[PDB]
Design a protein around this ligand. Structure first.
Ligand SMILES: [Mg+2]
Length: 246
């Protein structure tokens, strides 16, 4: 059998055109109908809007106030077993690690998302949070399939500069041979929501997994069509991933 998910920083902190952009995100989600959606930078009204328009999804949130992550579970496809929010004690931006244990098909999944500390100057904290995420990924049972997907904010060769990922933790994009068609998920040349004239791009949005039994089949960008307001759903592109379970 196969599983599919979308991971997406939908940029709820940009208050312009936000309902329209929410509608955009939801149309996008409706097109692909992923089993799971990992969202970052959600805000309460956006979350309510999701509860309304993304009605086929069960919404779990990493917080109730400010801005936060969310995991949407396709009703009828994904059965919720439990959730757990691991704190990042030294976050200055309310960041944490949202874990949702679910059953999908006949397989146990630990679904994880976070929006790691932002900006360059908070590299250290971001790395420590990444280490927390990885450790939590290691913690899970061997029977469970562990999938992290989120906005890592990783940049400046931080990962390889820090020794690279552990041996049993795989990057989906790397596993698929680093395709360039979906390498960059944040792109100020292609995306204009931030209205930055200079061309910057990063692979902020990443998918980590641990399993024995899990083979990434595909990786694609989403949210690449402009809306009526002449802007994209978010300053980030979404990442659609499909994986086989064996
Ligand atoms: Mg944002």
């Amino acid at each position: 059998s196969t599983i599919s998910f979308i991971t997406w920083n939908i940029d709820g902190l940009d208050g312009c055109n936000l309902p329209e952009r929410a509608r955009g995100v939801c149309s996008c989600l409706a097109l692909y109908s992923p089993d799971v959606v990992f969202l970052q930078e959600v805000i309460p009204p956006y979350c309510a809007y999701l509860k309304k328009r993304a009605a086929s999804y069960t919404i779990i949130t990493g917080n109730e106030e400010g801005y936060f992550t969310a995991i949407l579970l396709k009703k009828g496809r994904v059965k919720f077993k439990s959730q757990e929010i691991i704190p990042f004690p030294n976050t200055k931006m309310m960041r944490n690690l949202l874990c949702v244990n679910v059953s999908l098909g006949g397989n146990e999944f630990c679904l994880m998302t976070s929006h790691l500390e932002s900006t360059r100057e908070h590299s250290a904290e971001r790395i420590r949070q990444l280490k927390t995420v990885l450790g939590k990924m290691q913690e899970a049972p061997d029977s469970t399939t562990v999938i992290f997907a989120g906005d890592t904010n990783l940049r400046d060769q931080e990962v390889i500069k820090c020794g690279g990922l552990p041996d049993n933790v795989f990057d989906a994009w790397e596993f698929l041979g680093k395709p360039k068609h979906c390498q960059y998920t944040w792109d100020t040349k292609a995306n204009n929501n931030l209205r930055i004239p200079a061309a910057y791009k990063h692979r902020f949005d990443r998918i980590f997994f641990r399993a024995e039994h899990l083979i990434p089949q595909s990786l694609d960008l989403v949210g690449l069509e402009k809306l009526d307001c002449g802007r994209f759903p978010s300053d980030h592109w979404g990442l659609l991933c499909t994986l086989n379970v064996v």
